[PDB]
């Protein structure tokens, strides 16, 4: 909600030469990537009885693994 | 809240962003004052506009008064 505000878009359009603001924008994108990576890392750790079902689909398609 | 967003305030804290902030947020402050006055006078203006609409609703059609 914060990064998609119309005021932010208007400010970005008004000052194209915003390298100082561009640094903050890239910092925000890095925070985006870090948060998404952490959220996904909270997933690809463990599984359940779904492993037996998963083994059924790795046999018919050789060379396939790590379905998340 | 969008105007008072802490991230937007941090972006505001820039000098080159402050001039475009000057323009955009003086316009925004005028708009906020206008909308606050609109909320304050909403009841007052609705009765007056309703009276004008009723006057125009039955003005040039013969007969037809007291539309309720």
From Swiss-Prot, chains A, B:
Protein name as annotated: Retron Ec83 probable ATPase
Origin superkingdom: Bacteria
Function text: Probable ATPase component of antiviral defense system retron Ec83, composed of a non-coding RNA (ncRNA), a reverse transcriptase (RT), this protein and a putative HNH endonuclease. Expression of retron Ec83 confers protection against bacteriophage T2, T4 and T6. At multiplicity of infection (MOI) of 0.02 cultures slow growth when infected with T4 but do not collapse, at MOI 2 cultures enter growth stasis.
Organism name: Escherichia coli
